[PDB]
Amino acid sequence: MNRLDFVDKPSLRDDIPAFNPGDTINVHVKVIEGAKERLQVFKGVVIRRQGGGIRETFTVRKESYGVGVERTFPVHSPNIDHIEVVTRGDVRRAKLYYLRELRGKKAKIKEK
Amino acid sequence: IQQESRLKVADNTGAKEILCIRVLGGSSRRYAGIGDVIVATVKDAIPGGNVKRGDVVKAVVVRTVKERRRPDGSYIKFDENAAVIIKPDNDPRGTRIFGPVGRELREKRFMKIISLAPEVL
Amino acid sequence: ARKGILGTKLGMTQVFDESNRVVPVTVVKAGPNVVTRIRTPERDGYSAVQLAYGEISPRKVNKPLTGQYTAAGVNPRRYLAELRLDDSDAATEYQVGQELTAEIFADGSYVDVTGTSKGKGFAGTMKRHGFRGQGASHGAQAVHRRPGSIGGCATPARVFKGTRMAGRMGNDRVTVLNLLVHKVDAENGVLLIKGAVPGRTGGLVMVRSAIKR
Amino acid sequence: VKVNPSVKPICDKCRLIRRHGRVMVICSDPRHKQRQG
Amino acid sequence: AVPKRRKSRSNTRSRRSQWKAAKTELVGVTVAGHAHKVPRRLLKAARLGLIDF
Amino acid sequence: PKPTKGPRLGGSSSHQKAILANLATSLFEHGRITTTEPKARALRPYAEKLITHAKKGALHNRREVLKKLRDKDVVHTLFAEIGPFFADRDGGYTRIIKIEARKGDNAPMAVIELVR
RNA sequence: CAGGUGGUCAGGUAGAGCAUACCAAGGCGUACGAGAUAACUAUGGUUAAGGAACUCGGCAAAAUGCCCCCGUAACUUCGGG
RNA sequence: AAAUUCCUUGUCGGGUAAGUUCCGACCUGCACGAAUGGCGUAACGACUUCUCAACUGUCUCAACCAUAGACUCGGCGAAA
RNA sequence: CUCGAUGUCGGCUCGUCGCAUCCUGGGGCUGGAGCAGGUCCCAAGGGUUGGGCUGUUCGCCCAUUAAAGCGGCACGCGAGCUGGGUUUAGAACGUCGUGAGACAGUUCGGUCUCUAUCCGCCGCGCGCGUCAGAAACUUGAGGAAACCUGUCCCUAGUACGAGAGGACCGGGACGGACGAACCUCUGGUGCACCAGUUGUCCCGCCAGGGGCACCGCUGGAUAGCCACGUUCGGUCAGGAUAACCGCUGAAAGCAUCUAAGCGGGAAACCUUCUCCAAGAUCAGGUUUCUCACCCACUUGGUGGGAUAAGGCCCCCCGCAGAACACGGGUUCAAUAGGUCAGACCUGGAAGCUCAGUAAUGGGUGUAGGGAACUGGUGCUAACCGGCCGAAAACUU
Ligand SMILES: CC[C@H]1OC(=O)[C@H](C)[C@@H](O[C@H]2C[C@@](C)(OC)[C@@H](O)[C@H](C)O2)[C@H](C)[C@@H](O[C@@H]2O[C@H](C)C[C@H](N(C)C)[C@H]2O)[C@](C)(OC)C[C@@H](C)C(=O)[C@H](C)[C@@H](O)[C@]1(C)O
C-alpha cells in the first residue's frame, strides 16, 4: 500500500485507546445540534471493529429507551475527540453480533 | 422499508402497527428513510382512544434497522422500526414519542419531533 | 487548452474533508512522469499533444517506438497516449521534451477521468443490461435470468440491430466526469480524486480537466 | 388562433390575406385571428 | 430445431476445413542417442530424461 | 495456497483436499511423482508449504502437518530427512517437469519433484 | 438400461426404530477422461431491510420439528376436537 | 344471487387501504325443494373457496458460492 | 393464403414504432383580474409508479403522482416463459331432450415437445486486403448510447386583487426515479481461512487432531464479484426550425410577417458531450524502424530460398479470459510459485506450568492459524528456442 499507505498516513489519529470488541467505551462525538457546537457522549459497548487502518470503524451499541442503537463510528474520524473507554473485557468473539437480548440479563458482558 | 411494511408507531396515540400504504415524496419511490413521510394504515391501536384501525394516515419514520450513513462517515442502526404519525402542518398527531429518533430529522424539518424526542440521535 | 495528464490509479481510500465529512476518494498516481511530443494542427490537423508515461527498460520496447522516443528526445515510456488541445496550436503552451506533473489540477479543479473498465466477462443480459429477468418460482420452467423475447412475429421477421443481447461486456473506455480533486501530492506523486475512477487498480487513466465547470 | 380548415371573415374588419402557405385572416383584434389548415 | 435444408457442399466443406490441428517441434535436441525433435513444450524432460522415446 | 478458481480438482473441495494430501504423501514418500499438470499446479504451493513446516521442525509444525497428511510415518520422514534437506532453500522446494500427455484423455502430464 | 423382481440373515455406536448419522463382516470406487471461475440451465447453499407487496393461487421454499412438564376454546354423536 | 342467478360487480352490513372472491341477511328462485333425498352434520379430507399470525429470495431486486452441463483438449460418435 | 397444422386469451420478459400528447417544452385564443382554468396550434426527446377485486382486457376503488397516454407490430412476444381462461376425456347443479346426450349456462380436476442448419441479432476470433514489410499514436465519414422530473427558499406576500387568495421572470437549496463506474465505507456472499461444536470412526492409547454427516452445524470473515453502497451523469452553450411572433414592404398610391429581404423562436433536427469507428475497398494521416539478399531459369520478369524490422507458436501468468483474443513476463526477471516482514480475517494455538473434587479457568502470549492485498528476496518455473516475415511494373 506504500504510496496509498502514504495517502492515508498524514490522515491518521493518535493516542486513541486500545479497544477490541467487548470493551464498553464512551465516544464523545462532535455534533452541531442547535448551537455553534455540541458534544454527545454516546456510551455503549464495542460490538465490532472492522479494521483496515484509517478505514477502521467500531460499532458502539447503546440501549437507549427499551430500544437499542448500533452507532457505527469510524476510528480516526474527526467528529470524535474522546473515545473514553469505560470498562475493558477479554471476550470470546471478535464481532459480538449476538447482542439481541434487551432483557438485560445477558446484555452485560462480564468484567475483566 | 416500503409499501406493506409494519413498523411500530412510537407515540402516545395508541397505534402499535401501521402498514405503510405509500412512500410519499416521489413517483415510483420505494424506500422511506429515517425521516420521510409515509402514508400508513392502522393495523393495531387501542379501541376507543385517539385513533381507530384502518385509517389512511401519514406518518414519519424515526427508526430504520438499515444503517443510515451520515455524510460524516458514521452510521445509525436501530433495533426496531418506528413511525410517529403526523399532521399536515409540522406537528405530530401525538405529544410524546418513545425512544430515540434518528437525527436525520432536523433536515426534513418537523423540528417538533426532534423537540419532543426523549433523545435525538 | 484543456489541461490533462496521464497516470495510473493506486486504489481507493477515504479522506476526511475540511467540514468534517468523508471523501470516498480514489488515488491516482498522475505523478511527474508525463512528457510530450506535440501534434501540430498543420502537419496532421489535430492540435493535440502526445503525453508519455511509464518506466520501461530499452530492451522492453521495439525499434519503431524507441525511434519515436529518440526523435522526440525522451527515454521510452510504457504508455504513450494523446490528448486533443484546441482549434489552436499557440506554439508556446507545450514543447517536445516537456515535463508534466499532477500539479496543474489545483485542489478543487474538477477533472473528468477516462480509462478502460474492468471486464465484467462474457456477461449475460442481466449483468450486462439489467433485465428484470423472468420469475423464479411460479412455474417459470427454465427462463429465470433469460432474456425473454426478441421482437415480434412476421413484419420484423428479424431481430432489430442493437437488440440488447448477451455478449462480452467490460473493458470499454469510460469517462467519469466532474471528479473534484480533493488533494494533490506533488511531493510523492499522487492526485486524490473525490469519486470512483474507472478501471483496474494499477491501470492507465487519463485525468483531463473538466468541460462542465 | 382558431384553426378550422374552412376560413371566412367574422366581422367587417377581417382581411383574407394569404401568408406563406397557410391562408390566415386578420381583423387586427385577436378575438379569433383564425387560420386555415 | 432441425436443419431446415441440407447444406450446399460449399458450406459443408468450407467449415470442415476449419477443423485443423496445431503444431510445434523443436528440432535438433541432443539427448541420449541421435538428436530427437521433441516439442518446445517438453524439452526439459527431454534433456533430463523423463520422456518416452 | 490461495484457492483455485473454477472447478476444484477431483470432484468438489473435499475430494480436492483428499487428492492434495494423497499427492503430498506420495511426494514425501518417493520425491518424484507424476500427475496431470493441473494436479501438480495445485500441489506445488501446498507441498512447498508443508516442507516449510518440515524445515521448521517442532511439535507444532508436526501437529500442523499431521492436520494434512494423516500418515504418521511419511511425516516422520518429512520431519526427519526431507525437512533438514532444505537447510538452505528459502522457498523453492519442488520442481515441475513436463511429461507427454497421457494417452486416453490427452491429459497433460507433469512430474513434480522435491528439488533433490 | 437410474425402472421392476418373491423370501431369508441382518453387527456396532447415538437413537424409540429394521428411520437417520458414522462404522464391522463383507463389498465397491461400474466402465469416457483432463481441465476450465463464460453466458445460461439443473441441483443444493446463504442474504442485508421489508415480509405475500409475487401470484390465477403462499405454487415452490421457509418456518414449526423432539423429550419432558404445565395449559388447552368453540362445538360435540360425548368418542372426540 | 346457491357447485343451482341471465341480467350480475343485484342490495345492505362484516372483513380490506382498496374485496367482481369470502361471510351474514334480504328473496322478481331466468331455472331450488324433499330418499333422481330437503336442511343440517362433531370427526375426517394430498377436495374446492376465503381470511389470519409464524415464516420465508415468492417479491420489491436481485447478488454471491459448490457441484452436473455448457466451453476447451484427446476417444468413439448419433438423430429428427 | 394456410386443413399432408399459420399453437387461441390474459400475465410475464424483451421490445419496438406511430401521433390521434397524459406529463415535461414553446405558443394563440379565452366569457383569460391573480391562481388558475377551458379550448385550439407546434412538438415524440425522455417519462408515463405501487396495490385491492377479477383468468379477466374491461373496469371500480385505495395511496399517490409531474403524469399515472392511445395505439401498431399474427388483438407484437409459448423452437422465450405461465396455463389462471378458452373448446378433449372425469364429476355436480340448474335447464333442454322419452333417451343417448345438451347448453358463448355454471363449478371443481385436467402432459406446454425439439441438441438451432440459413437468415436475424449479440460477442469474439482467423484469413486477406489496405501496391515493400512492420510498429505507436491516433484523424473522423458514418454510427450508437443518452435526452425524465418534483419540491422548497428569496424575488415577494411583489404584481393582480374588496379580501380569502395570489403571480410571471430571475437566483439558490433539497430530492425522486433511471443509467454508468467503482469496492473506500455500509451490506450480501464466501466448498484450500479462523474458532466453537453435536453423532461416529480413525490416527495404538491420553493429549492433539483428522475423515464423513447440506461446507455437518453455528459465530465471524480479507480478496474477488456484487447492491442495499459510494461517486458521477442528465446539462450549460451554438445553428437551423415548427407553431406562433416581428421588422422593412409592395403588387393592389393603402393594410399586411411575404412576393424580394431580415429577426425572434422549443425537451423535437444537426451541432455540444460520452462511447465505437479507415473492411470509410473513398481501405486516411503524423512519425519511427528495416532495405542489395543469395540460387536457378526464359537475361529479365518469375518462382524459390535467406533473413531485416516485426509479429507469432512454445513456456510463467493475469482483478484478461468460454476457445481465440487482450495485457504482463522470460535471467539484465520480480511474471506466477515459494520464502520473509507487513495490511487484514479469526480470536487467544500446542506444550509446559499453576488453580480447581472436577467441568473448566488463569500464565507463557495480540498468542496461533491463514487465501487472494502490499513490499522484499534470485530458491522453483518461465529452459542454452521454432516459426512467419521485405526488395516495389510504371507514367506529367
Ligand atoms: C414426450 C414428448 C411429447 O411432448 C408433448 O406432450 C407436447 C407438449 C405435445 O403437445 C400437447 C400438449 C399440450 C398440453 O401442450 C402443448 C397441448 O396444448 C397440445 C394440444 O398437445 C406436442 C407438441 C403436440 O404438438 C401440438 O399438438 C397440437 C395438436 C397442434 C400443435 N400446433 C398447433 C401444431 C402442436 O404443436 C403433439 C402433436 O402431440 C399432441 C406432438 C405429437 C408428436 C405427440 O403426441 C408426441 C407423442 C408428444 O407426446 C411429444 C411431443 O412427443
DSSP string, chain E: ---SSPPPHHHHHHHHSS----------B--SSS-B---TTTHHHHHHS-S--
Indicate the SS3 state at residue C103. helix
Using CA atoms, how far apart are residues C131 and C118, in angstroms rounded to an integer? 21
What cell was used for E50?
Answer: 523423463
CA-atom Rg of chain E in angstroms:
21
Q: What pairs with residue B39 in β-bridges?
A: B58
Give me the amino acid identity at F99. Answer: I
Give the contacts of E27 (CB within 8 A, at least 6 positions apart): E35, E37
Q: What pairs with residue F112 in β-bridges?
A: F33, F96
State the residue for C-alpha cell 516439442.
E39
The answer to whether C143 and C132 are in contact (CB under 8 A) is no
State the residue for C-alpha cell 381507530.
B52
Which residue, F26, F29, F33, is CA-closest to F77?
Answer: F29
The answer to whether B14 and B5 are in contact (CB under 8 A) is no
Using CA atoms, how far apart are residues C87 and B88, in angstroms rounded to an integer? 58
Task: State whether A77 and B100 contact (CB < 8 Å).
Answer: no
Give the contacts of C170 (CB within 8 A, at least 6 positions apart): C117, C118, C119, C120, C121, C123
Give the contacts of C180 (CB within 8 A, at least 6 positions apart): C108, C109, C110, C111, C193, C194, C195
Residues 28-57 of A with CB under 8 A from C: 30, 54-55
Sheet with C22-29, edge to edge strand ranges: C8-16, C22-29, C191-193
Domain count, chain A: 1
Mark F27-39 as b/e (b = at least 16 C-beta within 10 Å): bbeeeebbbbbeb
Do C and F count as touching (3 or more CB pairs closer than 8 A)? Answer: no
Any idea how long chain A is? Answer: 112
Domain count, chain B: 1
Instruction: State the residue range of the domain holding B84.
Output: 1-121
Using CA atoms, how far apart are residues C125 and C48, in angstroms rounded to an integer? 39
Nearest residue, CA→C1' of I14: C149
Query: What is the bridge-based pairing of β-strands C206-209 and C4-5?
Result: antiparallel
Which residue, A19, A58, A26, is CA-closest to A42?
Answer: A26
Distance from CA of C167 to the nearest CA of A (A): 35
What cell was used for A24?
Answer: 464498553
Cα dihedral C74→C76→C81→C87 (10° resolution): 10
- Chain I footprint bases within 7 A of protein beta carbons: 12-16, 27-30, 40-41, 48-51, 62-68, 73-74, 76-83, 112-114, 116-124, 134-139, 144-145, 175-187, 191-192, 203-204, 208-213, 215-216, 219-222, 224-226, 229-235, 243-245, 252, 255-259, 273-276, 284-290, 309-311, 313-317, 319-322, 328-330, 332, 337-340, 342-351, 362, 366, 368-375, 377, 379-386
Query: What is the bridge-based pairing of β-strands B75-78 and C8-16?
Result: unpaired
Give me the amino acid identity at A25. Answer: I
Identify which of B72, B73, B78 has the shortest CB distance to residue A69.
B78
Resolution of the structure, angstroms: 3.3
What cell was used for C12?
Answer: 481507493
Using CA atoms, how far apart are residues E42 and F100, in angstroms rounded to an integer? 7
Using CA atoms, how far apart are residues A25 and A86, in angstroms rounded to an integer? 5
What cell was used for C209?
Answer: 480537466
Experiment used for this model: cryo-EM
Using CA atoms, how far apart are residues B77 and A59, in angstroms rounded to an integer? 10
Nearest residue, CA→C1' of G48: B66
